[PDB]
Amino acid sequence: LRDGMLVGLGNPLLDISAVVEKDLLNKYDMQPNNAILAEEKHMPMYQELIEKYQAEYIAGGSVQNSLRVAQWILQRPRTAIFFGCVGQDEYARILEERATSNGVNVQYQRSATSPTGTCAVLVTGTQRSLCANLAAANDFTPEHLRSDGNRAYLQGAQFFYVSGFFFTVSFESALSVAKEAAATGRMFMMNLSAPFVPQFYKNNLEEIFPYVDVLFGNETEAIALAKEFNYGTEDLREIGKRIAALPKENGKRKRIVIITQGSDPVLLIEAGTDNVREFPVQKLATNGAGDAFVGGFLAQLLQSRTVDVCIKCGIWAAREIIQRSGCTFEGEPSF
Ligand SMILES: Nc1ncnc2c1ncn2[C@@H]1O[C@H](COP(=O)(O)OP(=O)(O)OP(=O)(O)OP(=O)(O)OC[C@H]2O[C@@H](n3cnc4c(N)ncnc43)[C@H](O)[C@@H]2O)[C@@H](O)[C@H]1O
Numbered sequence: 322l323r324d325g326m327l328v329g330l331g332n333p334l335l336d337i338s339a340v341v342e343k344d345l346l347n348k349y350d351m352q353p354n355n356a357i358l359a360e361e362k363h364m365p366m367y368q369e370l371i372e373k374y375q376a377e378y379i380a381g382g383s384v385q386n387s388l389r390v391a392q393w394i395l396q397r398p399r400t401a402i403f404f405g406c407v408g409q410d411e412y413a414r415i416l417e418e419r420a421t422s423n424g425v426n427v428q429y430q431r432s433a434t435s436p437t438g439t440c441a442v443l444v445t446g447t448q449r450s451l452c453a454n455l456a457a458a459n460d461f462t463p464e465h466l467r468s469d470g471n472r473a474y475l476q477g478a479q480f481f482y483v484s485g486f487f488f489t490v491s492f493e494s495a496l497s498v499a500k501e502a503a504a505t506g507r508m509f510m511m512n513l514s515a516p517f518v519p520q521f522y523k524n525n526l527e528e529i530f531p532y533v534d535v536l537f538g539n540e541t542e543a544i545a546l547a548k549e550f551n552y553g554t555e556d557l558r559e560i561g562k563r564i565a566a567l568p569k570e571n572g573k574r575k576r577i578v579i580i581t582q583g584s585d586p587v588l589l590i591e592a593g594t595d596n597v598r599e600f601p602v603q604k605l606a607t608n609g610a611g612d613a614f615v616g617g618f619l620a621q622l623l624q625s626r627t628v629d630v631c632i633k634c635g636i637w638a639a640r641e642i643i644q645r646s647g648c649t650f651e652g653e654p655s656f
């Protein structure tokens with residue numbers, strides 16, 4: 322292990338989390354059990370959550386969360402580098418301090434014009450509804466990656482991870498990094514992130530897929546992808562196989578597709594096999610479980626462990642995060 326093995330590109334966001342009821346969702350034309358991008362009409366919701374629903378502030382953003390979980394497991398600071406854009410404000414210092422405390426080397430671009438992005442996380446019964454106000458995260462530019470220091474970080478990384486969420490902000494950066502990775506035989510990995518990603522950016526997804534070595538997503542994202550790509554099936558095993566079998570630029574590494582299903586088994590699909598492997602999870606009697614699953618996976622991948630160990634660490638990490646929330650980061654990883 323050495324510094325900067327993993328680079329992640331994403332949207333650093335402060336989560337604003339609260340328990341609410343359906344009338345709040347109806348007020349903002351939100352569905353239960355969904356993730357959306359904020360529009361003008363959503364904007365008053367953030368202050369309302371803070372002022373009237375006693376909302377909690379939690380460091381978030383998908384890729385940021387995953388790198389924080391991976392660092393917590395690694396216990397070796399600076400092993401992962403994070404790129405994304407924040408404001409110059411109090412929200413950015415909350416994100417900076419939490420991610421740096423966990424061991425991430427954060428390399429934030431700074432917007433002086435937008436505030437740090439936030440994500441409403443609304444809890445209603447056992448359902449969650451998310452509304453992401455990207456704001457400064459949308460000010461990310463390819464140029465941030467072209468400084469001398471930042472290009473040395475790209476040149477030195479061995480592994481790359483990008484969320485589908487980041488396509489909203491800079492697909493051009495994600496693709497550029499993916500092509501350089503394939504061309505130098507390094508791993509490029511990404512997450513489907515949310516149903517809106519294949520629904521909104523189908524062609525981007527198609528264009529980047531040849532350079533994807535590992536694709537993560539949940540069952541709902543996999544089905545959403547299957548609709549846009551016209552697979553005519555909702556069978557997750559079949560969908561995984563079709564994605565895994567897509568043309569691949571770096572033919573020397575066979576694509577892996579990993580599909581999480583909440584409390585049901587994690588599914589592993591490898592190109593060139595017709596046999597999907599399952600990793601059962603102990604059904605727990607919460608925020609970013611999928612992100613934590615990826616952090617656990619990446620912590621083992623960086624230590625060259627086999628995929629089955631990467632996935633078991635993912636499941637273990639998600640289950641820790643579900644138990645202890647932010648407190649998990651104060652403990653000692655005992656995987
Ligand atoms: N535009 C945007 N840009 C950037 N970031 C954005 C964004 N919009 C939202 N975000 C970020 O998204 C974060 C929240 O994500 P969440 O919506 O909380 O969920 P996730 O991490 O995406 O979970 P996912 O659905 O993928 O995984 P699954 O349940 O299959 O579960 C995965 C694993 O968890 C474990 N698990 C889950 N449920 C379980 C159960 N019931 N019992 C036991 N284990 C379980 C299992 O091991 C399972 O495989 C927020 O922090 C926010 O900042």
Ligand SMILES: [Cl-]
Nearest residue numbers: 331332383384
């Ligand atoms: Cl992200």
Ligand SMILES: [Mg+2]
Nearest residue numbers: 514539611612
């Ligand atoms: Mg997810």
